[PDB]
Design a protein around this ligand. Sequence first.
Ligand SMILES: [Mg+2]
Lengths: 50, 1340, 69, 71, 251, 34
Amino acid sequence: IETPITANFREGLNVLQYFISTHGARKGLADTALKTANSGYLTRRLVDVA
Amino acid sequence: YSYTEKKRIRKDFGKRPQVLDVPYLLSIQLDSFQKFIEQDPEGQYGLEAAFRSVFPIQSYSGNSELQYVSYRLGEPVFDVQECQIRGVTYSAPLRVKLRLVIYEREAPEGTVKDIKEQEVYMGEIPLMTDNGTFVINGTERVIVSQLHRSPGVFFDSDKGKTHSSGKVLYNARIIPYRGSWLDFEFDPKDNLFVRIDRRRKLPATIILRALNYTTEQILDLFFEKVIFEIRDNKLQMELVPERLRGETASFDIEANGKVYVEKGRRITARHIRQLEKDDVKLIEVPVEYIAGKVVAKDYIDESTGELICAANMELSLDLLAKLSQSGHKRIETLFTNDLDHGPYISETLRVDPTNDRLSALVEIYRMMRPGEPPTREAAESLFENLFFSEDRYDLSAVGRMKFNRSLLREEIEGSGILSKDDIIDVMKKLIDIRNGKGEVDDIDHLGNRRIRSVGEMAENQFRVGLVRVERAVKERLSLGDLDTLMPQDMINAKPISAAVKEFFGSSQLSQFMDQNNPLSEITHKRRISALGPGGLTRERAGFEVRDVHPTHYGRVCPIETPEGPNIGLINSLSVYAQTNEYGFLETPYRKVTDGVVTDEIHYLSAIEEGNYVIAQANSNLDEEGHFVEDLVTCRSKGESSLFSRDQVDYMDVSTQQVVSVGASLIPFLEHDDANRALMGANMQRQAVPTLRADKPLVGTGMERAVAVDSGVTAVAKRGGVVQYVDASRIVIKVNEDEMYPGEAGIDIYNLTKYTRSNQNTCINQMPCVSLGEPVERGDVLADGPSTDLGELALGQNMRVAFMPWNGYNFEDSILVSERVVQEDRFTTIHIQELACVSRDTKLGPEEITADIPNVGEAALSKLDESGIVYIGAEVTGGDILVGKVTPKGETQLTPEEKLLRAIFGEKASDVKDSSLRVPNGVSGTVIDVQVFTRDGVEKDKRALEIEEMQLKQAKKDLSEELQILEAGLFSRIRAVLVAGGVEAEKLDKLPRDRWLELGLTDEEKQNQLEQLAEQYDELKHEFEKKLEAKRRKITQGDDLAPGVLKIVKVYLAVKRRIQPGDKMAGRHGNKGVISKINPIEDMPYDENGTPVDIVLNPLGVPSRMNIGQILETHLGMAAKGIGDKINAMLKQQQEVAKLREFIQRAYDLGADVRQKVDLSTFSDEEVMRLAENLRKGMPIATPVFDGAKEAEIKELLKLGDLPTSGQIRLYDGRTGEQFERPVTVGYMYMLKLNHLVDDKMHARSTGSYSLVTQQPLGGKAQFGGQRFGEMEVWALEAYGAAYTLQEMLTVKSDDVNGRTKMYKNIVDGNHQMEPGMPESFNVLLKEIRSLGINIELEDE
Amino acid sequence: GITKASLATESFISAASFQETTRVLTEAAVAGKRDELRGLKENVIVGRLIPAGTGYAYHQDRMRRRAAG
Amino acid sequence: ATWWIRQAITRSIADQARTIRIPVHMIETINKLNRISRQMLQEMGREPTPEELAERMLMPEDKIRKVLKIA
Amino acid sequence: VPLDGGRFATSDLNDLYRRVINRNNRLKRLLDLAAPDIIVRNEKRMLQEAVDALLDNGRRGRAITGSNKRPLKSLADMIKGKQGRFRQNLLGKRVDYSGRSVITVGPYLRLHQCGLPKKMALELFKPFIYGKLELRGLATTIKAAKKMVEREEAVVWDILDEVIREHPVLLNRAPTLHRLGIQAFEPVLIEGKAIQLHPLVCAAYNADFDGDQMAVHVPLTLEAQLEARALMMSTNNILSPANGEPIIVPS
Amino acid sequence: EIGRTTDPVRMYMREMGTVELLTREGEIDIAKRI
RNA sequence: CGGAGAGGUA
DNA sequence: CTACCACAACGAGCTACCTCTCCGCATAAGTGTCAAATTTA
DNA sequence: TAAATTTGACACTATAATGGGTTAACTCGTTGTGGTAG
Ligand SMILES: [Mg+2]
């Protein structure tokens, strides 16, 4: 996005900057579970082959 | 201010003046079910709509019909509490007046032969409790709304699925409310196809032909015609100038005598403009231009009579020569381009192998039902029923609206089925999207998703039951007798009841209630699930629907969702978000007019929100006039930017409208990170209610609304003066202005005392008002489990120091002092229900008696003569609750005990021990024993005493109700008669009951006197009838499960205190586990001598980015310092003026705070009561995104005589030294989550085994063993750990001989294993042999 | 690849326990194969000591008794 | 032919429909009960009790006999 | 197998076998009855469909559903899959002598000690306590030992302290990504309900103290005890196996 | 045709539908032959 | 003592 | 004759634990002899 | 065991009845047909 979140977590955010940061928060939270599942599958295959 | 908040006024730091109050938080469910039940004859909603959509019904001939008249709901047999106790559904009988009219066949229209109408009984629809909850089979269930894709038409495109080409493929889709689907799509070669119900593909011109369209009509509908004229062996065209854009001049664009274009030049826009400024129409051409064009209409010679060229073939030199020598001087051709007018319909017709309509019907027949021999009538019926039938196709008038909106029509209404023009328009729009005009639609856009509530779903299921019974009745009516067949004798109530019961008991949406605190119930009823019937699944969703869309602003909270696999499928509705009439989500907005932000509020949907310009909620105003700044930040079309002060069109109603109920209770939400805010919002609904509820020092102001609207307190319906206060009930006398001249004016609020909740927690109602208090309407009288004077109080506020301490706070772990455990601040009550059923075995009934064998008096000291523990007796683990005894059976009988069976009596050694005991670790008193019996068998002395107590309590409390209400009525009669005349002493010299026969001349006041007497007589009559009904209801036997004699239900009440292992958390997601209970003398203590109750860990602050906890800590210290000053002043007993001055000074400290409270209005007693209520600390309201700042909290700290930095000097309690750095100290509001170590810990040595695999079971409830999964096997393998792996695979698992040998040897002290072949391997061998493939263990 | 190499292993029991049990079992049945129980997973399944670490010597001993007699 | 076809079909449904085979007379009684229940449910507006079914059902059948007849 | 409510809960294999046997018997009936050719052809076709549905339901065509509108479980489905025999009963098994509990922090321990609560220790070592009680002569029969440990005298506690001395137990936390997810510790008896871990081993376990749980297993035989003492002890696996760097680091 | 189909009901009805219905007197001569 | 569905924890 | 592409079909998706509720749903016509396995003394 | 009796099995109903209900319809890699065009 063009305009960045200028304020920090001490000065307190407004509505829209918090709403923007929610996107990254949710994306990271979902990617955690997805990469966990993929790593588990890869580990199982690697343990089997050797 | 009302009198319920004058007791304790929460100071508010908000600066935005709120215009719109928070609405009723449970409006969606109540409104939906009210629409479903209530009779709306015009706006057909719920039952009436389905009844009109099914009835009337004809026979296959049409000589007998059933006419709908009306319907009504009967009164429920049992009450809500009665149904909860008995475990039956709280439902209302549905009686429908149905009329059967019979027709003659001899007459043309013999409508009047016989009419028969009556009340047929069908179905028992469940009713909704006053809090939006259903009672099914005793349990309390909640039906959540569903956000599902709207009916209508959606144009989409796949972003380069075919990687080889990289082209964009567009596809349309027509989604009806119920019926078959329809999918228009393209291919890499740019041909358009139809998929019906996501089946195989055909060229899409098949549908056009099936709609009775020939090729010439198709080409007329899609392509527009260019006119080629042959005259005296030369060619001209009629040319419309706005067609040569982006093309290269293949020939010379000439005029009658003017030259315009040369070879190798593209017709640029300025040349086109020259063309419209020269006004030329007819343009001559050479012959090679036609070669490449396609003829529009067929051409047949009038002489020879055969077609030289039909529609849609590529014209060449030979064909045009033949047509010219034929004599057709005018040629119509389709116009084609490569950028704006593409030849797709012609290509699809070329690839199409079908000639006319019947072949198209044959082809669609072979699609839909492959392998079946086609026939004309079958194909016609299937095609007319796929789309053009009112019973197998419907858009429900909401798909119609979106359909006409997406196609840019005008009317929002129309037929419920598809039509020719609809298909033509949708495919034309698809063609235009392909060309470049228009844009595809978003799936996650909130303008395409609809809220389907409980009423709609119940209506649909009821309609399914109705069509089932309708098909049945139509079948039966057509062949059976018609004269003496009552309309009620065909209709079976079984299918409708089955449908509604299945929906209400076994759906994916009617789920168990989470009601461990009011906040959980509120956030559960305001829930939107994207899954369910007709929805997504956890596999059908990717990152596109789980993620936040810009249209969720104000409609759906972005920071309240489960953090597991349901990260984006379970959303929470916002605060001010209502629902549209169609089901769309809309938000309030303050309408601005030429600069003034008026108080007018408009509700806007998602599609309208993107049109205007919306101002932010944090914009300052001048005396509720114009904006202050000139460049206001605003949002439009989904993006945020800056705009002028005159370009705006709306403003956000409040700063709280973005977040939901749960996230709006967290103070300083704007400083917390998104992840920790999400975790705090998720953990706030798992807080167990404590013994004594305590208010939070730092609130938000939303606590009161959540407490009131949760339906868990006892709000006053009508204001008045409280008459009688008790721990069980409240008797209130209403004021004169709010009281009907019909009633007495006395209201009774009963209080629920110690009722088990769904999550095994206690529910209690403690009265908060005292005797002699005037209370108006809307005041709370009884606090619920987690309420304190009408404010939600989930946890306790405690002293906290942020400092590492000897490693006991290492990774989120928490150290707690002994003051917390001595004061039982986190001591909870857990009511647990145990059930014992006396089954009817195949050798005799199971008796409950005190004659349990092989048990001494040490275990029977709590049992009475009937074998049931006395109420109030404390019971520990392993003790006997009920002495149920069961026969063993001849198989379980040994010859030794068979001889004494026929000598020393039958009741000697026939039965065994099957009594109910306590699960290990559980203790506590017995509080309630319920004995349900089957109708027909005498119960015991105990159940007779139980029913005697029940009848005595019912008669007593109901008689007291009558006595109080009649006393109020007689008081009203006295007041009325002294309002009429002057009679004071003559009333009190005569008995109170004899106040009715006195009178004088008749007038209006005598009229309501007589009305009051009539109400008295009706009162006593209803008293007698309800008493008799209650007595009959309790004296009769319950309907139990088949094969069941009697059921004994025992309620135990454990008292749980905290111990190492219990989870705690704040409101900012700083969860942790208790590590140690520390004596008070070791706690780090401040200068005054007060030790800190809990020591947290500072390192959780920077890495998790939740600074809201530090600010809450400082604010709590400031509030508690002010409260401590108040308490010191009160203890010194100074004055009334000084306390008034100090409290007023503390209240008016903010810069531009919204509220204005003044103490001059309050009297001395109100001031004293307020000071008493604030002596424990002044509550503070900090709204989300508009809360207090650092300057205000520092001013509070200064007023309370505390250091401004918030850090004080601590001394080490163990040694007495001074810590080298000041330590942040303050009061934080901690909860106590429902993950207790008592329910988590479990151990097992040897127990029961499964049947097929013969390995130990799994589960704490059934005493199972821990699974040793595949990963741990790999780990032990990696160590090289052979022996441990073998012993965990054979002798500690499914190998019967090995494990019993292991037990025998370990009991004998020798530590050795004797492994064997596991049973699971033989199970596998037998299964694979049953597969028919020979496997065997090959010896050597 | 890892999946293909695992499926093409000479031991049909390990492949069946891994993935595509139907196809591997059908191939083993039609081919008339036999397993010599040389992998760790095979002995884990059947219920013997794994030929690794402490148990390894034992298996070698067993082998040196099976080969020499 | 209709009589024979219907008899064969209903006899087939009376031997192989459920996991546990029930004799034909018991199946006929089960229906002699299903219809009665429905008839009484329609007539009274609520499901019958065992005693009412005993009253309306048969001269030799009582509460215990039909209670045994329910599976 | 019957349930507690009198009703039975059979397996789908009984249903498949009933289908096959009924259709085969009717085929034999028709063959002896001299039915027309179309009739016997249909009966043979349904027999084939019964057989293949028995072998694996959802393979040939539409899966045969039971009463709850779900496809039936065939033998092939009981062989293969995530919840088949191989991956749920032969590789991973449920194990006796196992406990589970929440973990807290123990700062006074060493690298080779874990704080085991008294109740879980009593339950886990019950056969050992029976054996040592019988050897000492304080109990005559196994039932006497059972009831004695069931009412938990102090002598039972003393003998329990004797038994657990120098008897390592395995602590295990899922998911066990790498090999350090299971480790052998010497037990120390503590009053409470939480297993007390060492602060240094939290990096190997990837274990936080925010409500995490782990399981305890007990080696029985002498080979298992030496196996845990020389190979699995927390003082042996200091360096990580992935790279030659220490894993027990201050955190 | 005899092609892509798997439903036994569909095939059975397909071979069944190739035979025409009998009249009031066709059954009479069939019974006479019997 | 089974299997499904819903929810929760790490 | 055979090198090539686009469809159809099939098999795959961390781990462990805890709690709760559900599973013979709308449908159906009765008699009549002959054998026989469980039931009283 | 002789005898009773409720269960269990099988055989038989004579107007004309003539083609059935239905569900729901990501992403990826590998294999095998089914043409395709020169
Ligand atoms: Mg953790």
